[PDB]
Amino acid sequence: QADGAKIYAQCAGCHQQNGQGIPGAFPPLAGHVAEILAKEGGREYLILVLLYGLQGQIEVKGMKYNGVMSSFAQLKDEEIAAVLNHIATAWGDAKKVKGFKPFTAEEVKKLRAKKLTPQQVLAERKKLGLK
Ligand code: HEM
């Protein structure tokens, strides 16, 4: 099973069907996912956000966000890999990532041992050296 586009319905009210988010509220995923994936540790980070959530001040496309995102750990590993592959391809980000590797259920499964808080996920983000 696992249809990333269908699972994305759970994210769309915030990040939007076009992945552009809402400045001042929910960050964009379109365009931005490629930027994260280009960093070493970027794909793991995206999985951590889905498993553990995120909170804290971040900047995305030169705009500031200081909100909270819940964890989606209740989703199956296949579902998380599917929705992450969806946000990586729905708006063309994958083509923009040299050597893009699709997320897999096993990768997600492995990171379930981490047991992080949203603050630890922010600490992981800071190590990517984004903006
Ligand atoms: C749905 C399963 C869903 C996905 C997918 C998703 C992804 C996502 C990513 C990858 C980030 C990190 C962006 C970054 O620059 O680090 C992120 C961040 C936030 N999200 Fe999200 N998100 C999904 C669902 C939801 C839902 C339902 C909401 C709105 C209630 C939401 C909100 C946010 C917010 C806010 C952030 C930023 C958190 C911060 O520290 O400011 N997401 N999301």
Swiss-Prot record:
SUPFAM superfamilies with a match to the protein in the record: Cytochrome c
Taxonomic lineage from the root: Bacteria, Thermotogati, Deinococcota, Deinococci, Thermales
Chain positions recorded as heme c binding sites: C11, C14, H15, M69
Presence of the UniProt keyword Transport in the record: yes
Gene3D superfamilies, per the entry: Cytochrome c-like domain (1.10.760.10)
This protein's UniProt keywords: Electron transport, Heme, Iron, Metal-binding, Transport
Function field: This monoheme basic protein appears to function as an electron donor to cytochrome oxidase in T.thermophilus.
Coiled-coil regions listed in the entry: none
Record carries keyword Iron: yes
Descriptive protein name: Cytochrome c-552
Species of the source: Thermus thermophilus
GO function terms (MF aspect): electron transfer activity; heme binding; metal ion binding
Post-translational modification: Binds 1 heme c group covalently per subunit.
